[PDB]
């Protein structure tokens, strides 16, 4: 068994670039906040390291934080839609059918998506979009300020990620 | 033993169609918010599958979320009234006598009804209303905004459901 | 084995001098709130005692409290940057890469930084800045009052510290 | 404790950048033509680690290949001088004091430079033209001897500290 | 189950078409000599057998013969390019990162390139296949009587491996 991933990395979560999303009171329910394709490029670590290899296996945990104050109430649905289903047919009711975790903007704790569907990972080359299991978040419930004159408020949100302990790389490639 | 239900389904909760209910400050206490008859048709899954069969046995867990912000205080009573008792005689005090769970609109966590009364399920054909153990929710306590000028606020609520591990189907029928 | 540190000290946390920092709504995200170099001088205890010795080994736990009321939402990043990386290149995204713990201003509980990286401590003389593993805190998320007319509010914060059970002193020196 | 570097590097060699040196006939004896700092940056893969990681411990095994017609006569002197002593004022004789090996430009088998078993001011390594190169019957001054170097890390290399990529 | 190809082909080697490459002293190091993609088309016998079998499995042993006298001094490096990485700007410095074999122009006996052991592949143009390419590692310099142009000629031939076999039968097209 070969594991070139530092044990510290798997035990810590690091913010992913382009993982910053904002929720506004004018966002209609069901609107797509952020649609980031799960992959090693999310973590700043394993992006530099991934240049060594081309094929990778396993999953990667993702957790999201909502920096939302009280007086604003709403729910955000996070669904890991399998590839190919992304189209206008997607709706709030249908989103929950895929694996998901319900989150409240008022929560003061990180939310962890249950992306444990290893389903016997086959292969993932870093040159194709095939089987890029995407993550999409939508405003499950309309956002209201409860008459707190806080219309000019945006619920800032950030997403971190850490590699799974089963993560590994197969083939070596020279750095580009 | 035959269990044609995916183990993932029983381990996950999915929103039920027509399971969206709203609570308004003008709702008098004891008003019926939603009265949905428990059955396989609640879950989007087991509705397509139920077309195969006609008779089903077992119970199905139901949990409700209240997307309510602070500054509004109230309580909602959920009672699984046995069939035949639905009439004007029903009142807030009498509702709690049946199995129930008390919920607070300010709660930030899902509420699970204790619908564990298997009581040796007899049979349930999908052509009759007999023994359709209904679920009714009422405003246990009057809703007040605590002078937060949030009168134009509605506590959005959604209900999910998952099949019980004991759920099963008896007889096969061709799809319609 | 010689341990001249009182067992009570390691089991209790004491406020550190100059460990008071304030967060204002005008603080732009990424601004450095406080940058205190970890060392025995943080704790009022072990400062008088450190006069006896010159070299010390081990780490020291640090926890921070945020005396912040509701209606204000924000996140503060605490990163123990290794020495030599302090410069303009530091940014919010890069800060999380080092060991860190995410904190919410609304939290009502002390936050403990995971400064468990003993990494086989080598030596630390009390006359040089070498390997003075610093602690830096930055406003991870912009601070907003949610229209609560609380602009004239500052989130007071204090930091305590206790010596680790592995803390020890090597060489004796006369008091100065 | 863990070994981030893949074992494939341990059992195989790879050329290093700036390791191109040609023993031109118009070169005075003792002239410097191949100077390396003996650091992790030599191996292309190891250079990649230094971008991410900070602390490195261990040693490599430097291997040198020479292209020889089996006719031209010449020798190269390799001496891994300790850090600090190295400077411009370093005659060929002085380098002979430190550990060294003598190689012939006509040697088919590459020479394995001996390195003592073991960061800043690291141990250095320099090479000079011990003996001038002559065709000896080639009647041509355009001929040159190509030289390539590849460093393979020893099976004890590892890192200590963690740093964001830069 | 039953290997169709006769054992005679296995015991010998066949020159693949367009397997001829030329090395000249005036050719500076940095220009590729020949690009090869492993497949049944390399062996003419296997090329005609593709009609009877759409799917082929196994590997092929590839050997290279280089002709030259004892005066020349040069080295030839054979580099393995993983699929999907080939680029126009393929210099020699990074060409040795992949597994390779060291060879010289003064060799007499043929040198066998080490091929990694290894899934059924259809007859379509599936780019996923082990690619082979050689690069002029060092310049070819003559140490004799100033040869104006001593063209070093080499030939590449491959034969089916013992494990090579066809699994799916398809009538000839």
Numbering used by the authors:
A (entry chain A), B (entry chain A), C (entry chain A): 48 to 223
D (entry chain C): 48 to 165, 176 to 223
E (entry chain B): 48 to 165, 169 to 223
Excerpt from the paper describing this PDB structure:
Noroviruses are single-stranded RNA viruses that cause pandemic outbreaks of acute gastroenteritis. Norovirus capsids are made of 180 identical copies of the VP1 protein arranged in a T = 3 icosahedral particle. The icosahedral asymmetric unit contains three quasi-equivalent VP1 monomers (designated A, B, and C). Each monomer associates with another monomer to form P domain dimers (in either A–B or C–C configuration).
The design of cysteine pairs within the shell domain of VP1 monomers can lead to the formation of intermolecular disulfide bonds between A–A and A–B monomers. This, in turn prevents the disassembly of the particle into VP1 dimers. Because of the symmetry of the norovirus VLPs, a cysteine pair introduced near the strict fivefold symmetry axes would yield disulfides between every A–A monomer pairs. The same cysteine pair at the strict threefold symmetry axes would yield disulfide bonds between every B–C monomer pair. DS1 VLPs showed the characteristic icosahedral symmetry with T = 3 arrangement. Clear densities for the formation of the interprotomer disulfide between Cys116 and Cys193 were visible around the fivefold and threefold symmetry axes. In summary, we successfully designed cysteine mutations in the GI.1 shell domain that resulted in interprotomer disulfides, stabilizing the entire capsid. The resulting particles showed increased thermal stability as evidenced by the appearance of a second melting transition at 75 °C compared to a single transition at 64 °C for the wild-type particles. The lower temperature transition corresponds to the unfolding of the P domain, while the higher temperature transition likely corresponds to the stabilized shell domain. In particular, stabilized VLPs elicited a more focused immune response toward accessible epitopes, and (in the absence of adjuvant) the development of blockade titers was much faster than immunization with wild-type particles.
